[PDB]
Each structure stands twice: as C-alpha cells, then as structure tokens.
Design an enzyme around this catalytic site. Structure first.
Site, PDB file in Angstrom:
ATOM      1  N   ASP A 128       0.821  -1.192   0.000  1.00 46.49           N
ATOM      2  CA  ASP A 128       0.000   0.000   0.000  1.00 46.49           C
ATOM      3  C   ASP A 128       0.865   1.255   0.000  1.00 46.49           C
ATOM      4  O   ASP A 128       0.520   2.254  -0.647  1.00 46.49           O
ATOM      5  CB  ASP A 128      -0.864  -0.016   1.238  1.00 46.49           C
ATOM      6  CG  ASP A 128      -1.828   1.122   1.266  1.00 46.49           C
ATOM      7  OD1 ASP A 128      -1.456   2.208   1.793  1.00 46.49           O
ATOM      8  OD2 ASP A 128      -2.971   0.933   0.788  1.00 46.49           O
ATOM      9  N   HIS A 129       1.998   1.184   0.713  1.00 47.76           N
ATOM     10  CA  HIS A 129       2.929   2.285   0.896  1.00 47.76           C
ATOM     11  C   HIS A 129       3.832   2.545  -0.316  1.00 47.76           C
ATOM     12  O   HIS A 129       4.561   3.542  -0.343  1.00 47.76           O
ATOM     13  CB  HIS A 129       3.689   2.140   2.225  1.00 47.76           C
ATOM     14  CG  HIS A 129       2.794   2.214   3.435  1.00 47.76           C
ATOM     15  ND1 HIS A 129       3.318   2.211   4.722  1.00 47.76           N
ATOM     16  CD2 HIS A 129       1.439   2.277   3.525  1.00 47.76           C
ATOM     17  CE1 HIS A 129       2.274   2.271   5.538  1.00 47.76           C
ATOM     18  NE2 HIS A 129       1.125   2.304   4.867  1.00 47.76           N
ATOM     19  N   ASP A 130       3.755   1.673  -1.324  1.00 49.35           N
ATOM     20  CA  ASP A 130       4.473   1.811  -2.591  1.00 49.35           C
ATOM     21  C   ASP A 130       3.491   2.488  -3.580  1.00 49.35           C
ATOM     22  O   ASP A 130       3.919   3.135  -4.544  1.00 49.35           O
ATOM     23  CB  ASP A 130       4.872   0.407  -3.131  1.00 49.35           C
ATOM     24  CG  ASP A 130       5.831   0.327  -4.335  1.00 49.35           C
ATOM     25  OD1 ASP A 130       6.100   1.381  -4.969  1.00 49.35           O
ATOM     26  OD2 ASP A 130       6.262  -0.802  -4.681  1.00 49.35           O
TER      27      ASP A 130
HETATM   28  C1  HEM Z   1      -0.144  -2.273  11.098  1.00 54.77           C
HETATM   29  C2  HEM Z   1      -1.290  -1.628  11.038  1.00 54.77           C
HETATM   30  C3  HEM Z   1      -1.876  -0.577  10.197  1.00 54.77           C
HETATM   31  C4  HEM Z   1      -2.115   0.634  10.630  1.00 54.77           C
HETATM   32  C5  HEM Z   1      -1.847   1.125  12.032  1.00 54.77           C
HETATM   33  C6  HEM Z   1      -2.787   1.343   9.619  1.00 54.77           C
HETATM   34  C7  HEM Z   1      -3.173   2.693   9.824  1.00 54.77           C
HETATM   35  C8  HEM Z   1      -3.811   3.437   8.888  1.00 54.77           C
HETATM   36  C9  HEM Z   1      -4.167   4.788   9.066  1.00 54.77           C
HETATM   37  C10 HEM Z   1      -4.115   5.647  10.272  1.00 54.77           C
HETATM   38  C11 HEM Z   1      -4.561   5.216   7.874  1.00 54.77           C
HETATM   39  C12 HEM Z   1      -5.021   6.646   7.547  1.00 54.77           C
HETATM   40  C13 HEM Z   1      -6.523   6.671   7.949  1.00 54.77           C
HETATM   41  C14 HEM Z   1      -7.372   7.878   7.471  1.00 54.77           C
HETATM   42  O1  HEM Z   1      -8.278   7.727   6.491  1.00 54.77           O
HETATM   43  O2  HEM Z   1      -7.261   8.975   7.958  1.00 54.77           O
HETATM   44  C15 HEM Z   1      -4.443   4.109   6.998  1.00 54.77           C
HETATM   45  C16 HEM Z   1      -4.742   4.178   5.698  1.00 54.77           C
HETATM   46  C17 HEM Z   1      -4.557   3.124   4.829  1.00 54.77           C
HETATM   47  N1  HEM Z   1      -4.264   1.836   5.109  1.00 54.77           N
HETATM   48 FE1  HEM Z   1      -4.067   1.091   6.907  1.00 54.77          FE
HETATM   49  N2  HEM Z   1      -3.036   0.571   8.535  1.00 54.77           N
HETATM   50  C18 HEM Z   1      -2.436  -0.624   8.821  1.00 54.77           C
HETATM   51  C19 HEM Z   1      -2.452  -1.743   8.025  1.00 54.77           C
HETATM   52  C20 HEM Z   1      -2.949  -1.712   6.743  1.00 54.77           C
HETATM   53  C21 HEM Z   1      -2.916  -2.846   5.880  1.00 54.77           C
HETATM   54  C22 HEM Z   1      -2.433  -4.205   6.341  1.00 54.77           C
HETATM   55  C23 HEM Z   1      -3.402  -2.409   4.616  1.00 54.77           C
HETATM   56  C24 HEM Z   1      -3.606  -3.164   3.382  1.00 54.77           C
HETATM   57  C25 HEM Z   1      -3.463  -4.482   3.262  1.00 54.77           C
HETATM   58  C26 HEM Z   1      -3.660  -0.985   4.745  1.00 54.77           C
HETATM   59  C27 HEM Z   1      -3.939  -0.138   3.700  1.00 54.77           C
HETATM   60  C28 HEM Z   1      -4.196   1.211   3.914  1.00 54.77           C
HETATM   61  C29 HEM Z   1      -4.484   2.159   2.850  1.00 54.77           C
HETATM   62  C30 HEM Z   1      -4.616   1.902   1.410  1.00 54.77           C
HETATM   63  C31 HEM Z   1      -4.745   3.321   3.416  1.00 54.77           C
HETATM   64  C32 HEM Z   1      -4.953   4.684   2.739  1.00 54.77           C
HETATM   65  C33 HEM Z   1      -3.549   5.133   2.220  1.00 54.77           C
HETATM   66  C34 HEM Z   1      -3.479   6.538   1.647  1.00 54.77           C
HETATM   67  O3  HEM Z   1      -3.218   7.582   2.451  1.00 54.77           O
HETATM   68  O4  HEM Z   1      -3.645   6.767   0.457  1.00 54.77           O
HETATM   69  N3  HEM Z   1      -3.502  -0.578   6.071  1.00 54.77           N
HETATM   70  N4  HEM Z   1      -4.087   2.950   7.624  1.00 54.77           N
HETATM   71  N1  LIG Z   2      -2.756   8.602   5.225  1.00 56.45           N
HETATM   72  C1  LIG Z   2      -2.062   7.844   6.105  1.00 56.45           C
HETATM   73  C2  LIG Z   2      -1.546   8.382   7.283  1.00 56.45           C
HETATM   74  C3  LIG Z   2      -0.931   7.578   8.226  1.00 56.45           C
HETATM   75  O1  LIG Z   2      -0.181   8.053   9.276  1.00 56.45           O
HETATM   76  C4  LIG Z   2       0.057   9.468   9.351  1.00 56.45           C
HETATM   77  C5  LIG Z   2       1.142   9.827  10.331  1.00 56.45           C
HETATM   78  C6  LIG Z   2       0.804  10.201  11.634  1.00 56.45           C
HETATM   79  C7  LIG Z   2       1.676  10.927  12.454  1.00 56.45           C
HETATM   80  C8  LIG Z   2       1.260  11.343  13.822  1.00 56.45           C
HETATM   81  C9  LIG Z   2       2.056  12.187  14.599  1.00 56.45           C
HETATM   82  C10 LIG Z   2       1.703  12.496  15.907  1.00 56.45           C
HETATM   83  C11 LIG Z   2       0.567  11.947  16.481  1.00 56.45           C
HETATM   84  C12 LIG Z   2      -0.188  11.104  15.714  1.00 56.45           C
HETATM   85  F1  LIG Z   2      -1.269  10.502  16.282  1.00 56.45           F
HETATM   86  C13 LIG Z   2       0.114  10.801  14.409  1.00 56.45           C
HETATM   87  C14 LIG Z   2       2.957  11.197  11.966  1.00 56.45           C
HETATM   88  C15 LIG Z   2       3.352  10.744  10.723  1.00 56.45           C
HETATM   89  C16 LIG Z   2       2.452  10.067   9.926  1.00 56.45           C
HETATM   90 CL1  LIG Z   2       3.006   9.456   8.409  1.00 56.45          CL
HETATM   91  C17 LIG Z   2      -0.884   6.188   7.991  1.00 56.45           C
HETATM   92  N2  LIG Z   2      -0.378   5.050   8.708  1.00 56.45           N
HETATM   93  N3  LIG Z   2      -0.557   4.020   7.970  1.00 56.45           N
HETATM   94  N4  LIG Z   2      -1.178   4.365   6.762  1.00 56.45           N
HETATM   95  C18 LIG Z   2      -1.395   5.755   6.772  1.00 56.45           C
HETATM   96  N5  LIG Z   2      -1.956   6.522   5.821  1.00 56.45           N
HETATM   97 CA   LIG Z   3       5.499   3.398  -6.177  1.00 62.77          CA
END
Ligand code: HEM
Ligand SMILES: Nc1cc(OCc2cc(-c3cccc(F)c3)ccc2Cl)c2[nH]nnc2n1
Ligand SMILES: [Ca+2]
Ligand SMILES: *[C@@H]1O[C@H](CO)[C@@H](O)[C@H](O)[C@H]1NC(C)=O
Ligand SMILES: [Cl-]
Ligand SMILES: [Cl-]
Lengths: 103, 464
Positions: A94-96
């Site tokens: 997802d991160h790629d």
């Molecule tokens: C190891 C655990 C995982 C998280 C902790 C985690 C957290 C998030 C958060 C906070 C977001 C942003 C939420 C928002 O709408 O504000 C988030 C977005 C996305 N995830 Fe999550 N995720 C964890 C694990 C997964 C796994 C295993 C995924 C897929 C197999 C997965 C996918 C995604 C995707 C696509 C998003 C949105 C990404 C974007 O910003 O475009 N997550 N996740």
């Molecule tokens: N759109 C997103 C955003 C995410 O995390 C944002 C993030 C939070 C904080 C952050 C800092 C301080 C307090 C806090 F509660 C969050 C700092 C850096 C980042 Cl990168 C995700 N994690 N996994 N997928 C995600 N997709």
């Molecule tokens: Ca990429």
C-alpha cells in the site's frame, strides 16, 4: 521526456510517453465514478445537519463502527491459511502505491 | 486546529460521538479528522479531488522515495558504492538499521520518553508506524545494499549511480514478483485472479496506471487482517520473554522497540509463524485499531474503521450500490436482498439500521461485509476494485519486470527464482524460514525449512 532510458524516474515521470505524469507522484487520483458531495462539488455527506443522502439520514462513522465493526477481542478467529506476513506485505505494498496528504 | 478543536470549520471534519458510546462518554468531544488536501484549492469550478503523493507503480517507492530531494537524502553519497544510507547511531546485531528522521513533532519519541529513539527515515513517511512495517522497510534497505555490493564485485568499473540503479531495478522486480505471484492470488482467490489478472502479454501504453480514488479506501480491507498484538519469537521460534505478545496500542510509532528490544529478527519470525486475523462478518476489526489507534501519541485514541468511512465521505466516494453497479454486480435494495448478497440477514439488518438503504453503505463497510471468495480474502466487490487496479499497474507499467527490453531472458529466469523467505535469509540472522508460499505458511515447524535448502538469486546475467 527522453527517447532512450534504462531506468525509472524517482517521480514516475516519463513512464507513459504519451501522458508523462501518469503514475507520477504529487498528482490527482483518477476517478472511476463521479464524486458525490452534499453541494455536488466539495462538501462531504454528513457535513450539514439534516441534509440526507439519497433519501436517508447520514449515519455517524463512529456509530457504524460501534454497531457493526466492534467485536470482543478474546473471540478473534485466527486464519488457518494465512500468516501475519500476509497482512504486513499488504501494508508495505500500500505504501508503494498511495499516500493521501493532509494539511 | 483539527488535533484539538471539535468545531467543524475547514480543513476539519471531526467524527461526532454517538450516545452510549463504549469509550468516549463525552458527546462534546470528537475523533480528530483533517480533510485530505484538495488537488485544486479554493475552486468553484472543479469537483473536489484528492492527491496521490506517491508513484502509482510497484517500483519500491517506499524504499527509494517518490520525490528527487528525498531520494538523494536516502542514498549514501560518501562513496561510489551505490548504497542506501544507514543509521550511524545504532545497529541490529552488526546489521544495518534505517536512518533516523528530523521531524518537528516526532511521535516516536512519545512512545517511550526515556529511550529518546526518533522516527526512521524511509522512502515513505509511514515507515515507523508499526515495528512489523519498520522490519519490512529495514529488510529491503539491506537487500538493496546486499545487491549493490554483489554487483560491485561482479562489475568493478560500475559507478555509484549504475550500482544504485541496477540494485533498485532488482528490488522493484522482487516487489512485483512477490505481489503478483504470491500475494495477489491469495487476496483474490483463483476465479477473480483469472477474471482480473489474466496472463501478462505485454506493456499497453493506453492503460491508465493511476491509482483510483476508490482504491485508497478499498485496499484498507487489510484492516480486517490486523492482530491485536505484536508477536516476537526467539532463535528456536518460541515466545521471546519478556513481552512476547505486546498490545498493538503500545507498538504504534514505537521505533525504540526495533532499536532497544532485539531488532528485526524476532518481529520477522513473529510475522512468519503467527496466523493473520480472519475477517468474519461478526468479527470485522480489533479494538486495538477501533478504540486505541495512536492512543499514546495523541489526545485520544482513534477509530480506524470510522476514519475509513469518514475518509470515503471526505473523498466524495459513491456508496455501495454505485460500486456494485460499476463492477457489474446486482444492487440489493431491501434487507432481504442484502441478506442474500451478504449470505447473512443479521448483518444486513444491522447495515439497514445504520444506512436505511444499501445505496448509502460506505465502500469500505460494504466491501469488508461481503462473504469471502473461495481461497481468497475479499468478496466480489473488493475483488473487482482491487483486481482492476492491479491489472492497470501491471499492463500500464513500461518498466514491468516481464516487459520486453526491461530485463534479458536470462535476468528474467534468475528473478523468477526470488522469494520473500530467501530475502530474509540473506539479510538477517534467521536460518529457518517459511516454506513457499510465505503468505500461507504460518505454523512452526510444519511450514518451516532451512535457509540452505533455498537457492539464492544468481546475479551472473548482470556481468558486463
Ligand atoms: C499495522 C497496522 C496498520 C495501521 C496502524 C494502519 C493505519 C492506517 C491509518 C491511520 C490510515 C489513515 C486513515 C485515514 O483515512 O485517515 C491508513 C490508511 C490506509 N491503510 Fe491502513 N493501517 C495498517 C495496516 C494496513 C494494511 C495491512 C493495509 C492493506 C493491506 C492498509 C492499507 C491502507 C491504505 C490503502 C490506506 C490509505 C492510504 C493513503 O493515504 O492513500 N492498512 N491505515
Ligand atoms: N494517510 C495515512 C496516514 C498515516 O499516518 C500518518 C502519520 C501520523 C503521524 C502522527 C504524529 C503524531 C501523532 C499522531 F497521532 C500521528 C505522523 C506521521 C504520519 Cl506518516 C498512515 N499510517 N498508515 N497508513 C497511513 N496513511
Ligand atoms: Ca510506487
Ligand atoms: C557509507 O558507506 C560506508 C561504507 O559502507 C559506511 O562506512 C558509511 O557509514 C556509510 N554512510 C551512511 C550514512 O550509510
Ligand atoms: Cl474513483
Ligand atoms: Cl542517523
């Protein structure tokens, strides 16, 4: 946009020669369906109190979570045919692919 | 002021609290939410759309970066070795760790105040989100450096750029191979795999490789696979004491756990030998994510599934039926009909009580509710959205690993031999890894083998 290249750009620029920004970073997502907003162009559903979506009140995302998502932790069913690595690769993958910036 | 305010003013779209909530008893409080950055700010002409800050391609951009300055900073420029910069303060049993980042409001320091371990710096800003993810990032960092070193001994006259590039090109293909050969078939199941991902033929320049707005939400099906603990295992695949089962609400951003609690090996062993959580209609997602997401780095623990549904509304995504209609699937209109689609009337009633109509069901919620396809982990709707997206990323990538001219026939046959268990062997202290498929293998010792039985990636075809 170079006529000869051996490697990918860091931004994804030039992968598609006819439309060079396609798949490149810091660009707008493509839409498979037109967006559905309260005002038709920017306000999300649930923004204005009393404004229904297609005939019905908009449910609180937290209420949906509480009522349908919530389950007691101790009853978790482990998957007999998948490892935690299956979840992890999915997140790494997802991160790629996508990151949606916020203000 | 989204992190602290409850007033609904741009860019804030806070999640309101319902009566009789199981955790938040104060209804004047809320769950913080920032609306995603609009592609065209202030516009009274275009329909609000969101930005992808990353490259849509499966090119290991989470390792290398999607922006030129970040990508330079990730490289070791002290020499012509073509390596990625590594941590200069710490090591994991002599092995490399990701460099630390210079965040203004670093959330990792909050996870353990005394430790003073900051967030890691990777190709993607989310590297330190969970130590299992940091492990995968640290693994690929080592894999790149391992490849660049091997290539230097093979081709001594190659410069840093060439070494960097060639290793990046291999890492990208490895990510593609693992995804398409091993990961995707287990997500979709055999039928959806044939339907959406038929045998690759060649690059098609008329295939839009962009990420669809819907995908950002649909691919969050993975949230239903999350286990409430971080499992760590010792040399003998046994619980590592103390703390073998640390809660998920104590590992978010806990970069110190990688640095000060045994490095990546116990985490990778845990990932390999622990089952994933299974999505069940009455067991959707765990409370460590539904109640305690980012609990220790924030004023209040977030609710991930609620954020998913609020995000889809912020993104203006059409509801369940419009996506069913787009995929060519029947669109139920009543409780009975929905009960039939979900093979579960109980769930259909709960969904009708919340939404009133299947048209209003938020994409993530509708998608994760559907019964799973045979030998897959998604229902028909998510299988369609996901499958459709991954075909576009494959057929629309000019640098797809199998595309004529990207690699040589020999290089292609050498890459066909890669595996995630082997990458673990080559870059860790682990000597016993998962039998292929790593995504299915979860029981020690039943599904585990010695590293010696696994052949390495032969770089012979890369000699000049
Ligand atoms: C190891 C655990 C995982 C998280 C902790 C985690 C957290 C998030 C958060 C906070 C977001 C942003 C939420 C928002 O709408 O504000 C988030 C977005 C996305 N995830 Fe999550 N995720 C964890 C694990 C997964 C796994 C295993 C995924 C897929 C197999 C997965 C996918 C995604 C995707 C696509 C998003 C949105 C990404 C974007 O910003 O475009 N997550 N996740
Ligand atoms: N759109 C997103 C955003 C995410 O995390 C944002 C993030 C939070 C904080 C952050 C800092 C301080 C307090 C806090 F509660 C969050 C700092 C850096 C980042 Cl990168 C995700 N994690 N996994 N997928 C995600 N997709
Ligand atoms: Ca990429
Ligand atoms: C650069 O490479 C040399 C040789 O491997 C190493 O000693 C040095 O620490 C590296 N620097 C970084 C920042 O990784
Ligand atoms: Cl879309
Ligand atoms: Cl450092």
């Amino acid at each position: 946009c170079p006529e000869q290249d051996k490697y990918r750009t860091i931004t994804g620029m030039c992968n598609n020669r006819r439309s060079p920004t396609l798949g490149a970073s810091n660009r707008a997502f493509v839409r498979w369906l037109p967006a559905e907003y309260e005002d038709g162009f920017s306000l999300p559903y649930g923004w204005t109190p009393g404004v229904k979506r297609n005939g019905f009140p908009v449910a609180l995302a937290r209420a949906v979570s509480n009522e349908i998502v919530r389950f007691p932790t101790d009853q978790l069913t482990p998957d007999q045919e998948r490892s935690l690595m299956f979840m992890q690769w999915g997140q790494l993958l997802d991160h790629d692919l996508d990151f949606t910036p916020e203000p | 002021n989204c992190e602290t305010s409850c007033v609904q003013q741009p860019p804030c779209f806070p999640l309101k609290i319902p009566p009789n909530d199981p955790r938040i008893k104060n209804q004047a409080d809320c769950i913080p939410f920032f609306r995603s950055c609009p592609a065209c700010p202030g516009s009274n002409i275009t329909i609000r759309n969101q930005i992808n800050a990353l490259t849509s391609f499966v090119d290991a951009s989470m390792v290398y970066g999607s922006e030129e300055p970040l990508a330079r900073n990730l490289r070791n420029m002290s020499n012509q070795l073509g390596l990625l910069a590594v941590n200069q303060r710490f090591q994991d049993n002599g092995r490399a760790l990701l460099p630390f980042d210079n965040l203004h409001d670093d959330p990792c320091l909050l996870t353990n105040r005394s430790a003073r371990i900051p967030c890691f710096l990777a190709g993607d800003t989310r590297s330190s989100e969970m130590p299992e993810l940091t492990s995968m990032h640290t693994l690929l960092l080592r894999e790149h450096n391992r490849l660049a070193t091997e290539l230097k001994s093979l081709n001594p006259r190659w410069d840093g750029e060439r070494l960097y590039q060639e290793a990046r090109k291999i890492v990208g293909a490895m990510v593609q191979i693992i995804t398409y050969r091993d990961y995707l078939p287990l997500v979709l199941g055999p039928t959806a795999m044939r339907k959406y991902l038929p045998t690759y033929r060649s690059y098609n320049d008329s295939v839009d490789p962009r990420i669809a707005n819907v995908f950002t939400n649909a691919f969050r099906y993975g949230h239903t696979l999350i286990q409430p603990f971080m499992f760590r295992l010792d040399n003998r695949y046994q619980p590592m004491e103390p703390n073998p089962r640390v809660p998920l609400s104590r590992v978010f951003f806990a970069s110190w756990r990688v640095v000060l609690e045994g490095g990546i090996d116990p985490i990778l062993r845990g990932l390999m030998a622990t089952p994933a959580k299974l999505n069940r209609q009455n067991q959707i997602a765990v409370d460590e994510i539904r109640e305690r997401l980012f609990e220790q780095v924030m004023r209040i623990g977030l609710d991930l599934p609620a954020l998913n549904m609020q995000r889809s509304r912020d993104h203006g995504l059409p509801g369940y039926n419009a996506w069913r209609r787009f995929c060519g699937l029947p669109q139920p209109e009543t409780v009975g009909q929905l009960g039939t689609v979900l093979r579960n009337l109980k769930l259909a009633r709960k969904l009708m009580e919340q939404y009133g109509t299947p048209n209003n069901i938020d994409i993530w919620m509708g998608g994760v509710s559907e019964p799973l396809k045979r030998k897959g982990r998604v229902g028909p709707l998510l299988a369609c959205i996901i499958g459709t997206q991954f075909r576009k990323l494959r057929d629309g990538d000019r640098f797809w690993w199998e595309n004529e001219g990207v690699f040589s026939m020999q290089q292609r046959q050498a890459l066909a031999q890669i595996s995630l268990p082997r990458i673990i062997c080559d870059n860790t202290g682990i000597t016993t890894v998962s039998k292929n498929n790593i995504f299915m293998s979860n029981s020690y010792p039943r599904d585990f083998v010695n590293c010696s039985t696994l052949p390495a990636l032969n770089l012979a075809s890369w000699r000049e």
